[PDB]
């Protein structure tokens, strides 16, 4: 009956942003002021909804999306932003109704010599639609010559590694991000506070 937010926020490992994870939250009582009230977060921005307000409402579903990005990119996880993350990795809609939460995860996701397991999509012909998730790894053709699945000049693997090392500047350090979005169609309302 209690929403499994700890499953999301306290997960041992987080997804790369291009392959962002979505948790569906249903048939539970939430309570987000206990979640919000937590000096443990560097970002906690809500759009539409106010936080102390969410304890009052009933949505028919809630999604918790989560992933890791660089400190400098957290600002792209907002309605109306552009840049490599918003354009080609994770895109919020202009009329987004939800909250974006982020915290510095340098003490978890960095390694001496660089942790290279977290990736972002660098190359993509078109912008993602909101809440679109592109996990293709096709070689990206930047020129006129077909790649035939082989990397080379003008034929680039589309995903690139972050290099998370502990002494990086804060803008280059990993941040774990959770996006909560609130779903109200017309049916049962299975998630309340």
């Amino acid at each position, epitope marked *: 009956n209690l929403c499994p937010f700890g499953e999301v926020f306290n997960a041992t490992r987080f997804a790369s942003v291009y392959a962002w994870n979505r948790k569906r939250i249903s048939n539970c009582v939430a309570d987000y002021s206990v979640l919000y009230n937590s000096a443990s977060f560097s970002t906690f921005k809500c759009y539409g909804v106010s936080p102390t307000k969410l304890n009052d409402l009933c949505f028919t579903n809630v999604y918790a999306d989560s992933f890791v990005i660089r400190g*400098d990119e957290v600002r792209q996880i907002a309605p109306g932003q*552009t*840049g*490599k993350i918003a*354009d*080609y990795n994770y895109k919020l809609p202009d009329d987004f109704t939800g909250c974006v939460i982020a915290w510095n995860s340098n003490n978890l996701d960095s390694k001496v010599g660089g942790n290279y397991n977290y990736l972002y999509r*660098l*190359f*993509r*012909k*078109s*912008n993602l639609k909101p809440f679109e998730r592109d996990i293709s790894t096709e070689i*990206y*053709q*930047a*020129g*006129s*010559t077909p790649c035939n699945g082989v990397e080379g*000049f*003008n034929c*680039y*693997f589309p995903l*690139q*590694s*972050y*290099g998370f*090392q502990p*002494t*990086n*500047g804060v*803008g*280059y350090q990993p941040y774990r991000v959770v996006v909560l979005s609130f779903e109200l169609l017309h049916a049962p309302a299975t998630v309340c506070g």
Partner: antibody
Amino acid sequence: EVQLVESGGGLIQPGGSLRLSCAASGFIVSRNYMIWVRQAPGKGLEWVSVIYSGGSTFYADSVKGRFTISRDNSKNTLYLQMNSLRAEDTAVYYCARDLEVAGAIDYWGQGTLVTVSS
Amino acid sequence: EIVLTQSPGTLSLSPGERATLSCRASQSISSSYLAWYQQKPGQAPRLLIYGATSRATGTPDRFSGSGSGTDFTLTINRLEPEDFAVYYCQQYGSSPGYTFGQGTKLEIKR
């Protein structure tokens, strides 16, 4: 052969407008990060603008609101539209293809000289 | 925003010697986001190194990149007359997305 050929630079009065062109061969402009970089006489390099394959654009503070980067897919050409030109915009303007962590700025056009003077 | 400060401003060395060019960043950046260029007079810049250490197409082994954080170095072994140029460093990880150093001008003695 792969290359970037620039044109459009020349003399323009302060307050006037010029459009620079960058015709590409090989590279598909609309599939790349494409940039403009300028170099005033005797000075260093200054990044000016970038356009993403998905169409996002960004600008240096020194040109924001006056310059517009754009492209024409059918001509495979990159443009820079410069308005309200000032004396300090006088420079050689380069277009170039950017690969970011996959290779930085690996190909540059030859440069076209813009002179802002009355 | 980030500033890249190159030193020395000017350098003059004999053929066969080794030039050491420094690039210092005002804040720590990941080495994945630093590159070096060579610009000879009348020409566009030529990419030498990207990602601090990776050699671009056509860059011979006598050009070597190193560094991390706030301190990067370009080394040019076995200098020759055609190495006369201005050398620039460049970051592409921090706001506004592209910044260049002010350049080191290399003269080749004879």
